[PDB]
Amino acid sequence: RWHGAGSTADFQKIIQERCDTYTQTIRPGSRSRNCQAIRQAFMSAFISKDPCKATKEDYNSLINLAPPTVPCGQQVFWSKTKELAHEYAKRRRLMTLEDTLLGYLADGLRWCGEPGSSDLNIWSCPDWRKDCRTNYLSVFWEVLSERFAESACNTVRVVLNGSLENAFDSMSIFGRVEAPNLRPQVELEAWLVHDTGKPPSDSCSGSSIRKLKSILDGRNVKFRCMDNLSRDQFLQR
């Protein structure tokens, strides 16, 4: 029925198993959380509904069970730097969205339902461009991203791509949802990191980063920007 790839096979089992692994072996001691209840809430958010009428409100109950809150001074944002940013966060024992409970559950997966049915659509799912932006996969990442940004505290870091013409993309989730909802008075450190021995194409003094700085000034968030670093110099530091 849709243009996008279908749901991850065995979605329900994958998320519950990821939840067990996360809560018991990845970030334990926190107060306890029921993984069966989390799985049930996640399914209830989208199953049997119109797959192109997802709203942020559909996810309030799921997120309340496990908000994407990272301890102060440990939070990492990224944009166009997925691989690098996660390497960095892993090495420094920091957390990206994909390191929160719900982000860990959902990372890399696909899901959508079908009206009337209680089952996943494993055959096809709304593509964001061809079908609808208001789909359950896209909306999940948006609302999770917003709460993650709102809960950030003290010093936060962002890894950006110094090999693009514009390291800051105002239409990205980081630019649209995260930066504009950053808790006021936190401090943000940006790292603009470039490839290989390929000379950077954007810097902290470029137009796009000046736009980011304007947003942060508006949030009363202090900004420090470092650039002209290759992947190795950034990670080795």
Which run of H or E residues covers position 161? strand 155-161
Solved by what technique?
X-ray
Query: Can you tell me the distance from the alpha carbon of 74 to that of 71, in angstroms, rounded to the nearest whole number?
Result: 6
The residue type of 118 is S
Is-contact 164 129, C-beta < 8 A? no
Task: Give me 165's structure tokens.
Answer: 């013409």
CB atoms within 10 A of CB 237: 9
Resolution (Å units): 1.8
Q: Running DSSP on this structure, what letter comes out for residue 72?
A: T
Query: Can you tell me the distance from the alpha carbon of 221 to that of 211, in angstroms, rounded to the nearest whole number?
Result: 14
Residue by residue, DSSP assigns 47-65 as TTS-TT---GGGGHHHHHH
What residue ranges define each of the domains in the chain, with the CATH number in brackets?
Answer: 1-68+96-151 (1.20.82.10), 69-95+152-237 (3.40.50.720)
CB atoms within 10 A of CB 36: 10
CB atoms within 10 A of CB 31: 4
Is-contact 170 147, C-beta < 8 A? no
For the chain, helix (H) and strand (E) counts, in that order, are: 9, 6
Query: Can you tell me the distance from the alpha carbon of 166 to that of 172, in angstroms, rounded to the nearest whole number?
Result: 11
Query: Can you tell me the distance from the alpha carbon of 65 to that of 225, in angstroms, rounded to the nearest whole number?
Result: 35
Active site residues: 72, 153
Which run of H or E residues covers position 210? helix 207-218
Is-contact 5 128, C-beta < 8 A? no
Place of tokens 């968030």: 221
Q: Is 220 annotated as a binding residue?
A: no
Q: Is 237 annotated as a binding residue?
A: no
